[PDB]
Ligand binder design. Structure first.
Ligand SMILES: *[C@@H]1O[C@H](CO)[C@@H](O)[C@H](O)[C@H]1NC(C)=O
Ligand SMILES: *[C@@H]1O[C@H](CO)[C@@H](O)[C@H](O)[C@H]1NC(C)=O
Ligand SMILES: *[C@@H]1O[C@H](CO)[C@@H](O)[C@H](O)[C@H]1NC(C)=O
Ligand SMILES: *[C@@H]1O[C@H](CO)[C@@H](O)[C@H](O)[C@H]1NC(C)=O
Ligand SMILES: *[C@@H]1O[C@H](CO)[C@@H](O)[C@H](O)[C@H]1NC(C)=O
Ligand SMILES: *[C@@H]1O[C@H](CO)[C@@H](O)[C@H](O)[C@H]1NC(C)=O
Ligand SMILES: *[C@@H]1O[C@H](CO)[C@@H](O)[C@H](O)[C@H]1NC(C)=O
Ligand SMILES: O[C@@H]1[C@@H](O)[C@H](O)OC[C@H]1O
Length: 743
């Protein structure tokens, strides 16, 4: 509910004055309240102040890939009633696999519209814990499915588009739409691997790796997309918990990245974790005091509302710190149109008629269509027009809730691969033959019986929330259970066999890759509510595959080569490396790898430059329409992408760069640009504009400073190195972006 700024008790307070400054309105509201009232409102499940007519407000609300279940959200218990469902989009891993920034922005707009519609019915808050922009650096993280991938630049572009779409633009032009919250600011990418609990895990991260990998996403989020909120994670960095670290929360988030007087929520009772089990403070009150002084403005729990009074009395914190945090929160609320009349807010006029819009359903289907990656095909795909009898088999064959991942809402419909095959008029023989993880072969027979008389076998399996989830990291990155045995038996029939590998993290498909009896292999991840229809549209040829792998499919033995606790990415005497840019082994399928139903010819649409002076680039940086030097351009490629095949398709141009200059070591590759050229009809030649900035070409040294270094740089366009171009930077090395040193 919202206050009554027309007749209620706050009507004569400056907080109810729309003409006044938002920060001044928050100040007027906070000065009107009692210190203890302020304290009992410093938590996510705030009760408001019944004296002044301030209604309750739950800050903990979830909408990762669509309006999700959360403490701040309820869905109508009646299945067909209004607000019983919401557009459940596919997991952000497949969404990053789309590599479509326009699509990500439109999805963010849909999510924000539906969140506003739910809030107008008293069924959702106005701030949402989204997105999760922690890089999926270790292949066996349970929550890496919630993230776009493993590339900090790709995640940066994703989060820029998503924040701008959710919040309603690059600025609160009038009011916010919804307030976002970039998740877990730290080196958080571990749940319980070998007993290392995130709530007691001490991540050791070098400043170089800190600024080069774990923070670019948050810098793009709060500095370039101007987010309204950030969340500090459970883990500790270099011995200090994040929510209690002034260097992480103040020196970087509020200052270097410029969150300013936006509000920082703690991970849910991570403030309590600072005491138990992080052991960091001797008393609980001291834990909450250090958390507050470090920058944590609101606690997702109950630690603040029952300890901050004692902290003020024990002189650990002052009344003014509580008032500062409350002013930040209430100022974001003022910007959300909390204290303004509904007559002047179109976003407050949204209802149930705006939720399951056909545009939203079609956009979810399109996201799934663009996100699925074709890993292998011998020409069996697209399915022959003469194929009529298909056998669908596997633990993912009739997937419905598995298709949603985690942090989801109740979808209006869950179209399974089986249901979609039936929707396309296929004579389907179904059998799930084995579970996700089991040794029971008793279903194999059924599978075989369903497939022995079929024109095509479609095995659909992999992993799901039973294998990877919040609080359960994977121990093996292989096909769980006896799934590979069933695939092998199906391949003994030597029919057209198509294997669908699902789930967030990758599983070792090298056995499938090497077997000639396996004709086609796709990765489906969590394709959302319309996932089956998208997969079948790709199979039949209705939609051409165009997605590309956002993460590396490591071979199995990788789990033995590096511990999940090793936060360093570079190789060494005990590290094969991390991610595509440092890994020294031979991945089964590379980052950015993808197949199409058509062949492409890539050339130059404009002769590329080959020489740049660093000082000239830095000087011209002040004249480009950017506010920070690292956002200024270095150059823009114009690739000519010709469709030399016979099928229309989209193409994802993935501009990679490699240098041997600047700080050693220097990565293999680094995704410095990417674009999605949509719908290239056969024969036609479309132009791909690929823009590289100074911040993506510069190098991060031991000090964590981003600077330009002279020498030879090479750049190519695909994982197959379609075209390549080598230029040189000359002149003197110039610092582009400083870095506050650890306090
Ligand atoms: C808001 O305050 C200003 C003075 O700061 C006053 O002139 C204006 O009338 C007030 N608006 C309302 C709606 O009371
Ligand atoms: C503290 O919070 C409780 C809700 O659990 C509320 O009843 C009480 O009034 C709050 N204290 C003050 C001083 O408002
Ligand atoms: C959802 O709304 C109904 C009535 O609007 C309310 O009674 C119920 O408690 C809400 N659900 C939750 C989980 O708060
Ligand atoms: C950890 O807790 C123990 C008490 O069990 C205490 O003696 C020790 O000083 C603590 N160490 C740290 C680093 O918190
Ligand atoms: C497929 O799943 C749906 C929902 O889980 C269920 O209603 C249906 O019976 C299943 N189909 C088969 C053939 O098991
Ligand atoms: C597929 O598995 C579900 C439970 O996982 C079960 O209800 C269903 O019966 C299975 N399919 C068949 C054909 O038995
Ligand atoms: C399969 O389940 C077992 C527990 O029964 C688990 O230890 C193992 O990690 C799972 N396999 C995979 C590949 O995740
Ligand atoms: O990632 C967060 C998780 O740690 C918490 O337990 O639930 C809310 C999420 O935002």
């Amino acid at each position: 509910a919202f206050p009554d700024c027309a007749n209620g008790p706050l009507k004569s307070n400056l907080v109810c004055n729309a003409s006044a400054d938002p920060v001044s309105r928050a100040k007027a509201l906070v000065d009107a309240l009692t210190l203890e009232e302020l304290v009992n409102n410093t938590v996510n499940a705030s009760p408001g102040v019944p004296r002044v007519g301030l209604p309750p407000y739950n800050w903990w609300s979830e909408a990762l890939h669509g309006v999700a279940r959360s403490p701040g959200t309820n869905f109508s218990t009646v299945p067909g009633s209004p607000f019983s469902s919401a557009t459940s989009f596919p997991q952000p891993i497949i969404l990053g696999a789309t590599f479509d920034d326009d699509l990500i922005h439109s999805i963010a707009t849909v999510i924000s519209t539906e969140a506003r519609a739910f809030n107008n019915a008293g069924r959702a808050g106005l701030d949402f814990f989204t997105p999760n922009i922690n890089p999926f650096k270790d292949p066996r993280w349970g929550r890496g499915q919630e993230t776009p991938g493993e590339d900090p630049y790709h995640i940066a572009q994703y989060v820029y588009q998503l924040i701008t779409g959710l919040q309603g633009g690059l600025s609160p032009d009038p009011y916010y739409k919804v307030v976002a919250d970039c998740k877990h600011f730290a080196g958080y990418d571990l749940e319980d691997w070998h007993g290392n609990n995130r709530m007691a895990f001490n991540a050791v991260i070098s400043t170089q790796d800190l600024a080069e990998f774990y923070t670019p996403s948050f810098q793009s989020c709060v500095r370039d997309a101007h987010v309204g909120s950030v969340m500090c994670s459970y883990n500790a960095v270099n011995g200090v918990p994040s929510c209690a670290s002034p260097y992480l929360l103040q020196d970087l988030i509020r200052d270097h990245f410029g969150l300013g007087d936006g509000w920082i929520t703690s991970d849910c009772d991570a403030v309590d974790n600072v005491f138990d089990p992080h052991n960091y403070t001797s008393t609980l009150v001291n834990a909450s005091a250090v958390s507050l002084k470090a920058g944590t403005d609101v606690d997702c729990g109950t630690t603040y509302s029952q300890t901050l009074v004692d902290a003020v009395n024990q002189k650990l914190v002052t009344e003014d710190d509580v008032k500062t945090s409350m002013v930040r929160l209430y100022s974001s609320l003022v910007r959300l149109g909390y204290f303004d009349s509904p007559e002047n807010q179109p976003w407050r006029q949204l209802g149930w008629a705006d939720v399951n819009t056909p545009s939203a359903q079609a956009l979810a289907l399109t996201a799934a269509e663009e996100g699925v990656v074709l890993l292998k095909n011998d020409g069996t795909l697209p399915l022959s027009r003469r194929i009529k009898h298909i056998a669908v088999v596997g633990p993912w064959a009739n997937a419905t809730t598995q298709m949603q991942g985690n942090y989801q809402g109740i979808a209006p419909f869950l179209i399974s691969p089986l249901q979609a095959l039936q929707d396309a008029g296929f004579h389907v023989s179904f059998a799930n033959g084995t579970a996700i993880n089991s040794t029971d072969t008793s279903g194999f027979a059924s599978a075989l019986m369903a497939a022995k008389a079929a024109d095509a076998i479609v095995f659909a399996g992999g992993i799901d929330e039973t294998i990877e989830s919040e609080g359960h990291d994977r121990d093996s990155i292989e096909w769980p259970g006896n799934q590979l045995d069933l695939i092998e038996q199906l391949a003994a029939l030597r029919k057209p066999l198509i294997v669908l590998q699902m789930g967030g993290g990758q599983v070792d498909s090298s056995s499938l890759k090497a077997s000639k009896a396996v004709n086609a292999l796709l990765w489906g991840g969590y394709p959302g509510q319309s996932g089956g229809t998208a997969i079948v549209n790709i199979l039949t040829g209705k939609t051409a595959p165009s997605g590309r792998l956002p993460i590396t499919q490591y071979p199995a033995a990788y789990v033995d080569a590096i511990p999940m606790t090793d936060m360093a990415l570079r190789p060494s005497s005990s590290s094969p490396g991390r991610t595509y840019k440092w890994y020294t082994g031979t991945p089964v399928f590379d980052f950015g790898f993808g197949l199409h139903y058509t062949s492409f010819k890539l050339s130059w649409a404009a002769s590329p430059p080959s020489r740049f002076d660093i000082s000239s680039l830095v000087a011209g940086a002040k004249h480009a329409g950017v506010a920070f030097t690292d956002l200024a351009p270095l150059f823009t490629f114009h690739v000519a992408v010709k469709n030399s095949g016979k099928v229309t398709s989209d193409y994802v141009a993935l501009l990679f760069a490699h240098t041997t200059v600047g700080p050693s070591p220097a990565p293999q590759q680094e995704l410095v640009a990417y674009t999605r050229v949509k719908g290239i009809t056969p024969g036609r030649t479309a132009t791909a504009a690929l823009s590289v900035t100074l911040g993506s070409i510069a190098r991060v040294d031991e000090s964590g400073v981003r600077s330009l270094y002279p020498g030879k740089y090479s750049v190519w366009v695909d994982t197959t190195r379609e075209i390549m171009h080598t230029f040189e930077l000359t002149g003197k090395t110039t610092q582009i972006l400083g870095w506050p040193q650890p306090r």
